[PDB]
């Protein structure tokens, strides 16, 4: 039997602030990791609802569900069942940074993540602080291996609910927490929508597809 | 008659909060524009004592004092009466994250400073949050024009208690109010010094010493 299976559910729970508003999520979700395709249902537990965008956490609940073509070497799912970890940093047009810490493992043929999230910066009059925005567009994280670890690097823009657009930077190290095969440099694309929400998104359903190619 | 004289002093107030501790600090300096010189005495008003360290705060209390040969167009000296803006990211080698938002004006004869600094996701254990940092090695800020502002970038070395080093990377963009003549790339080396502070940092004196120089 395979560690990761055709269908994988994961659990979630993520923690941070942002403007120093503290908040708790809990989630679950699930998916086929070799289809490249997942959703998810996230619940706000502490510090709703969230006085800012809820875009800007969207991207933080799942690398293991990345559709990778045979010759790609898979470095995150060949690190479990340990798992593997991640950084990130996001740097938004307007002076905004949102930091993470994630932690993923496999318990119970269930994966497991953890996330911490921190943000701060940014403008109270902001489109993140007015809840302006309304999803990302679609996007590409340009991969590379780095001194031992996964690397991605994405040029990200949120659609804004007046027009026009709000773009960040992404930066992400991912590090497996046993030595396995990193790939070369290679291209994701990825969708990432919302396709539910209560009104004050306290309640979040979330669907990504994510399919590795060549440059 | 000038309006940058060979002496000058200035107030500064900073504002912010690092891992959500909120603060300020009110201060006055003085010095040399032309000489590159100065010095400033700064004072916690609200949260003291700070439960991180000092050094991530210093180089934010003076781009009106740095000695710039003749032939290095002084932007930020140009700058005023109006005066300038800057926009600083501090990036540490440990996840931890500093923006800086300043606003520099000249009135009555005296330098204005407004600051407003946001850090967040530095380790409890590390050695910001922990108090284990001893001082800035003296420093070079790459400068460059860029989009119609002033860039510098720097990779600064912070000294640790109990020896090795604690690394972050600089970037700040400088505004001028008005349009004023921009540099070609050039270097400014910088000499910041904790002179004198009392037991919990509530009272700290510094000194800084730059001078531009061709790349």
Not at 60 to 82: M, R
Not at 132 to 144: L, N, V
Request: aromatic share 12%.
């Amino acid at each position: 039997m395979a560690i990761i299976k055709e269908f994988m559910r994961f659990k979630v729970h993520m923690e941070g602030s942002v403007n120093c508003h503290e908040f708790e999520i809990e989630g679950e979700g699930e998916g086929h990791p070799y289809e490249g395709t997942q959703t998810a249902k996230l619940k706000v537990t502490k510090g709703g609802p969230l006085p800012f965008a809820w875009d800007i956490l969207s991207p933080q609940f799942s690398k293991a569900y990345v559709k990778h073509p045979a010759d790609i070497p898979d470095y995150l799912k060949l690190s479990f069942p340990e798992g593997f970890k991640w950084e990130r940093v996001m740097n938004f047009e307007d002076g905004g940074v949102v930091t993470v810490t994630q932690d993923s493992s496999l318990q119970d043929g269930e994966f497991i993540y953890k996330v911490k999230l921190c943000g701060t910066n940014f403008p109270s009059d902001g489109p993140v602080m007015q809840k302006k925005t309304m999803g990302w567009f679609a996007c590409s994280e340009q991969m590379y291996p780095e001194d031992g670890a996964l690397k991605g690097l994405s040029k990200m823009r949120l659609k804004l609910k007046d027009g026009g657009h709000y773009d960040a930077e992404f930066k992400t190290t991912y590090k497996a927490k046993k030595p396995v095969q990193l790939p070369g440099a290679y291209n994701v694309n990825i969708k990432l929508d919302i396709t539910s929400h209560n009104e004050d998104y306290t309640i979040v359903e979330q669907y990504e597809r994510a399919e590795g190619r060549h440059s």
